[PDB]
Each structure stands twice: as C-alpha cells, then as structure tokens.
Amino acid sequence: KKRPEDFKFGKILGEGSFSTTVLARELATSREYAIKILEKRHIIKENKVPYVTRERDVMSRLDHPFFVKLYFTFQDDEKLYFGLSYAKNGELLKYIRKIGSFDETCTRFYTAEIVSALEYLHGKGIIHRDLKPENILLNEDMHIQITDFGTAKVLSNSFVGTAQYVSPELLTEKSACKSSDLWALGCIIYQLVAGLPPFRAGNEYLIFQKIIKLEYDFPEKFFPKARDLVEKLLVLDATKRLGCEEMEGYGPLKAHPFFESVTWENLHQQTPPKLT
Amino acid sequence: KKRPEDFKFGKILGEGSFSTTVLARELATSREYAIKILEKRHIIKENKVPYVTRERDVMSRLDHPFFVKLYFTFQDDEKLYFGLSYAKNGELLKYIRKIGSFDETCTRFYTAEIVSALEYLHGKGIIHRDLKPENILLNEDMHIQITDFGTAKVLSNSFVGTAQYVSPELLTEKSACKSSDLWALGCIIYQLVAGLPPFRAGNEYLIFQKIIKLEYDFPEKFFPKARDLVEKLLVLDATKRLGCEEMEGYGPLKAHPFFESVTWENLHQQTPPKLT
Numbered sequence: 402k403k404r405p406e407d408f409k410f411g412k413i414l415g416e417g418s419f420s421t422t423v424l425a426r427e428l429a430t431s432r433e434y435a436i437k438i439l440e441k442r443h444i445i446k447e448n449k450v451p452y453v454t455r456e457r458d459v460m461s462r463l464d465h466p467f468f469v470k471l472y473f474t475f476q477d478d479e480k481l482y483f484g485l486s487y488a489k490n491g492e493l494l495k496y497i498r499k500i501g502s503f504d505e506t507c508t509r510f511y512t513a514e515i516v517s518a519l520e521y522l523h524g525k526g527i528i529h530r531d532l533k534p535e536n537i538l539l540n541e542d543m544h545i546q547i548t549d550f551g552t553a554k555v556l557s558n559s560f561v562g563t564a565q566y567v568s569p570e571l572l573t574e575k576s577a578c579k580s581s582d583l584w585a586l587g588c589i590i591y592q593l594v595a596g597l598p599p600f601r602a603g604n605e606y607l608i609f610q611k612i613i614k615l616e617y618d619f620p621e622k623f624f625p626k627a628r629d630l631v632e633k634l635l636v637l638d639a640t641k642r643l644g645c646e647e648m649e650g651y652g653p654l655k656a657h658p659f660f661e662s663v664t665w666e667n668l669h670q671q672t673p674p675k676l677t
Numbered sequence: 678k679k680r681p682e683d684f685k686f687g688k689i690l691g692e693g694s695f696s697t698t699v700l701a702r703e704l705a706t707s708r709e710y711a712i713k714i715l716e717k718r719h720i721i722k723e724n725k726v727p728y729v730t731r732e733r734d735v736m737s738r739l740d741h742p743f744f745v746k747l748y749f750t751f752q753d754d755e756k757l758y759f760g761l762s763y764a765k766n767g768e769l770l771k772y773i774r775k776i777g778s779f780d781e782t783c784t785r786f787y788t789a790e791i792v793s794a795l796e797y798l799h800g801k802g803i804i805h806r807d808l809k810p811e812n813i814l815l816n817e818d819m820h821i822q823i824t825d826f827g828t829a830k831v832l833s834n835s836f837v838g839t840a841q842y843v844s845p846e847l848l849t850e851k852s853a854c855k856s857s858d859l860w861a862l863g864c865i866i867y868q869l870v871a872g873l874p875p876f877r878a879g880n881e882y883l884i885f886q887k888i889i890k891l892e893y894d895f896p897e898k899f900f901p902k903a904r905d906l907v908e909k910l911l912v913l914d915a916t917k918r919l920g921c922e923e924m925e926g927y928g929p930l931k932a933h934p935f936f937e938s939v940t941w942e943n944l945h946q947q948t949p950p951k952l953t
C-alpha cells in the first residue's frame with residue numbers, strides 16, 4: 402500500500418477544480434506514474450463522490466492497451482491518489498495543431514486505434530461520454546491511451562460533455578448511449594482530416610444550434626472514403642450510426658472501405674506512421 | 678476473470694513435472710503473456726499446495742521491474758493458470774553460453790541489476806532460494822526479469838535448490854537466509870566473468886563436497902575488482918557475506934569498488950551494454 406513518501410513528485414501534467422495530475426517517480430523502482438490527486442473536501446462539497454467512485458471502478462475493469470491503466474490507489478487525510486500510466490507524448494490535440502491536419506495514412510491508423518478501443522469499451526457496457534483529442538493521449542511509442550473516465554456511464558440523462566463533440570440526442574432527448582461516443586468519433590475523424598472540429602461557432606449555444614441542424618460541411622479535398630465514413634457517423638438519428646447495435650455493432654464499422662488496408666488484430670504492435 | 682478461450686496458446690517456453698509455461702496471445706488485446714499451467718491433481722498428489730500457494734502470494738507482492746509480474750490467475754476443472762510477463766529473450770544462461778563469458782562492462786551492468794533486484798526482494802523479507810542464470814530471464818529490452826518463486830521463503834530447513842548454487846550452511850546447518858541468495862550471487866558473478874560456475878564436479882555429492890571446503894579458484898585474468906567482490910560473497914560463514922544484515926545490508930555491497938561507475942537509481946531505464 403503506497404504513500405506520498407514513496408514518490409518524488411515532479412511536473413504538473415494537468416490541473417482541474419482542486420485536482421492535479423503530477424508526474425511522479427517511484428523511489429523503489431524508478432518507474433514513472435502520472436498520479437491524479439483529488440482533494441476529498443472539494444469532492445464532498447461538490448457532490449462528486451459518485452463520479453470519483455465511478456472513475457476508479459471503470460478504470461479498474463479496463464485492461465486494454467489503448468486505455469490508461471490504474472496501477473494503484475491510496476489516500477491521506479486530505480487527498481485521494483490514483484497511480485495511472487504515464488503517456489509521455491501528451492494529447493493527440495497537440496499533434497493536430499502541430500502538423501495542421503493528418504495525411505490519409507495517419508488518419509487511418511489513429512482512427513483504427515480509436516475504433517478498436519471503443520469496440521472494447523463498448524463491449525464492456527461502458528460509454529465514455531466526453532471523447533475528444535484532449536482525452537486521447539499518446540504514449541512513448543505513439544500509440545493512443547484514452548483517459549478521463551470520471552464522467553463515463555456504466556450501462557444497467559445527467560452529464561453532457563465538451564460542446565463541440567456533443568451529439569444531437571443529448572441536446573434533444575437527454576439520452577446517452579454508445580452512439581454518443583460514435584458521434585464524437587465522427588467529429589474526431591473530421592478533425593484529423595480537416596484540422597478542426599466540424600461544428601464551430603462563437604459560443605456553446607451557437608454550436609449546439611448547428612449540431613442539431615447538422616450544419617457543417619466538408620473541405621473540398623477531404624479524403625473521399627473518410628468523408629463517407631464521417632457521413633455515416635454524423636447522423637442525427639442515433640440508431641442509424643455505423644457501429645451501433647441497431648446497425649449490428651463494430652463489424653460493419655470496421656469493414657468500412659476507409660479501413661480496407663487495416664489489420665485490426667494487433668494494432669498496438671504495429672509501428673505507427675510518422676506524423677507528417 | 679479470464680479463461681483458456683480468451684487466449685490463443687502458442688509455443689511451450691518450458692516444461693516441468695506436469696507443468697507447462699506456454700506463450701499465449703490474448704484475443705481481445707493482442708497482448709502476449711507467458712502462461713504457467715499447473716495440473717491440480719499432481720499438485721495435490723505431490724503435496725505441493727503450500728508451494729503453489731506461496732508462489733502466487735509472493736508474485737502478487739512483487740512490483741518491481743526486475744521481477745516477472747503476475748497479471749492474472751484463473752483455473753478450470755483440471756488446471757491453474759498464472760498469467761506472467763513474457764521475457765522475449767529467454768535465459769541469461771543462453772547468453773553466457775552464446776558469448777562464452779561477459780566483458781567487464783556487461784558483468785557490471787547485469788550484476789548491478791541482480792544486486793538491485795535482491796535488495797528489493799530482501800527488503801520485503803522474501804528469499805529466492807534457487808537463484809541461477811536459468812531463472813534470470815531477459816526482456817525485449819535486455820533487462821533482467823527474475824522468476825521461479827515456487828521455492829521462495831517468506832521470513833516470519835526444507836528446500837535445497839540447484840546444486841552448483843547451494844550455500845555451505847544449507848549443506849551443514851539446514852538453514853536458509855538472505856545470505857543464501859548472496860552466495861548464489863557470488864556464484865553467478867563468477868559464472869559471468871569465467872563462463873562457468875565455481876563449484877563443478879561429476880555429480881552432486883562431489884559438488885557439495887567442494888562447496889563446504891570452499892574448493893574453487895579464479896582464472897588468471899578474472900577482473901581484479903570482480904574477484905574481490907566474489908571473495909566477499911563466497912564466504913563460508915553466512916554472517917560475513919557482503920550484503921547481509923550482520924554486515925549492514927546492501928549499502929556496503931553497492932559501495933563495493935566493482936560498482937564505482939554504477940548509477941543504482943534507474944538501472945531499468947539505462948540502455949544495457951551489447952552482449953559482446
């Protein structure tokens with residue numbers, strides 16, 4: 402059972418509320434962990450116990466190379482500590498801004514990884530509900546590591562995620578499902594190819610308003626097969642989105658022509674394409 | 678909770694009694710594990726329940742990069758399955774035979790890793806009791822992964838290990854301790870530098886007989902500082918071996934002149950020296 406004193410804490414990787422992810426090195430092992438630290442007081446005052454509890458519970462059930470791993474938890478008088486894998490290369494968003502937009506080979510590889518992680522997550526009855534390039538981290542090897550499970554839902558209303566990636570049914574029926582993540586997936590693919598997300602406006606109200614009207618368009622040289630896939634994910638009716646249960650799940654989504662050359666079986670052992 | 682059907686089993690990595698380590702690939706993840714499989718019947722008939730139970734218990738308490746990790750256990754009607762890290766490069770012994778004997782840089786690096794793993798193991802009150810190059814595996818990155826904890830002892834007689842690495846007090850007092858591992862350590866260092874273990878004979882009786890008489894010698898060009906360290910580990914009185922409690926533990930052992938240039942703190946992140 403580990404304690405703060407077992408680690409040399411280093412730089413802050415991110416900050417929330419009263420919250421911090423800190424890079425830490427374990428003294429006994431020299432291993433690096435990204436340690437999420439949460440102030441018990443603020444969790445209690447903000448009624449966030451079900452959320453923090455859900456986060457720990459979902460991450461404990463996840464055992465897949467495209468997800469951040471929970472190695473350990475501990476707590477002191479003030480704080481909860483979660484020891485998480487450390488993704489050295491940061492946010493996918495960093496790479497989208499840096500190189501502007503991805504070529505076709507890079508879009509295909511990283512979409513396939515995300516599709517493959519979703520298949521696993523959805524197969525466990527878990528929906529992410531806030532999927533976005535900020536939450537899709539990159540490891541030392543440039544493979545994805547998805548994170549941020551505080552707001553996830555374990556299937557047996559309430560939380561709406563980041564505006565640009567919100568699906569119409571969330572704005573209209575207060576309902577969330579696996580197709581909510583598939584919508585975010587279409588927004589991410591568009592964002593990889595185009596360099597920016599599809600629904601953009603001056604404020605949230607205006608973005609929500611475009612989302613429910615399906616008011617976006619494709620730039621002229623958008624990869625034709627990627628556009629076709631995006632058009633089958635960005636569908637207002639959540640039961641007609643490629644990848645969902647009503648459309649027979651991941652098999653048809655993975656068979657999409659955009660993925661023709663993908664070997665789905667061992668993506669995390671394939672060498673990723675160089676980002677431009 | 679995993680089952681045989683979650684894996685594609687491949688080649689046999691080793692075989693014991695009615696026992697097998699099989700390389701397996703997990704279908705959901707494409708991850709490779711070395712899966713140890715044990716027949717419950719033979720464990721029961723051979724009265725090996727305390728040993729199998731101890732193995733699982735010791736490996737579960739180990740969390741260090743120089744030890745094989747236990748990721749999961751399961752069982753069916755006939756068999757126990759332990760999912761273990763897979764050390765791609767096999768046995769250190771393979772490398773000793775292949776290159777004949779290690780240069781000074783390679784002896785120093787790999788001894789330091791073993792010393793550093795022992796420090797951790799001994800700090801948890803666990804003694805290995807069968808340490809040998811066959812049990813010191815090499816990962817994809819050429820760092821050590823120590824294994825075979827069935828015969829380990831958790832400190833609060835009985836088991837003697839492989840003849841060539843048995844310490845005198847085991848042959849004389851039926852007593853085992855941390856210095857038993859430190860003796861094996863001196864035999865291993867000698868073996869790295871010389872190419873062969875120090876006590877060799879036609880049979881076990883004859884090897885035991887040399888051990889208790891300290892009947893071995895150094896080849897003429899044996900690294901002088903390595904010989905000095907070996908002479909301080911191969912000591913008949915187990916309370917006078919460098920590294921043991923009566924000699925104040927690992928600090929003096931790690932300060933030994935042979936280790937002058939070693940950075941003890943992050944060995945598993947250092948790039949190992951090329952084996953010749």
Ligand SMILES: Cc1cc(CNC(=O)c2nn(C)c3c2CCc2cnc(Nc4ccc(N5CCN(C)CC5)cc4)nc2-3)ccn1
Pocket residue numbers: 414415416417418420421422435437469485486487488489490491492538548549550551
């Ligand atoms: C503080 C907080 C966060 C969250 C959601 N985020 C995380 O759990 C989370 N946030 N981060 C930043 C991480 C995680 C998971 C665990 C985790 C593991 N590895 C990394 N790697 C990493 C490395 C560098 C960056 N950078 C470089 C510095 N740059 C200016 C910003 C991004 C970001 C992430 N990051 C994380 C919710 C509430 N409070």
Ligand SMILES: Cc1cc(CNC(=O)c2nn(C)c3c2CCc2cnc(Nc4ccc(N5CCN(C)CC5)cc4)nc2-3)ccn1
Pocket residue numbers: 690691692693694696697698711713745761762763764765766767768814824825826827
């Ligand atoms: C079957 C059995 C074993 C034991 C003690 N050994 C192990 O637990 C053990 N034995 N092996 C072979 C392993 C382990 C730990 C878990 C483990 C993880 N990685 C490897 N890697 C590996 C790869 C190749 C070889 N080779 C290449 C084939 N070569 C001809 C022999 C060695 C050996 C080990 N090996 C193992 C006790 C009772 N029954």
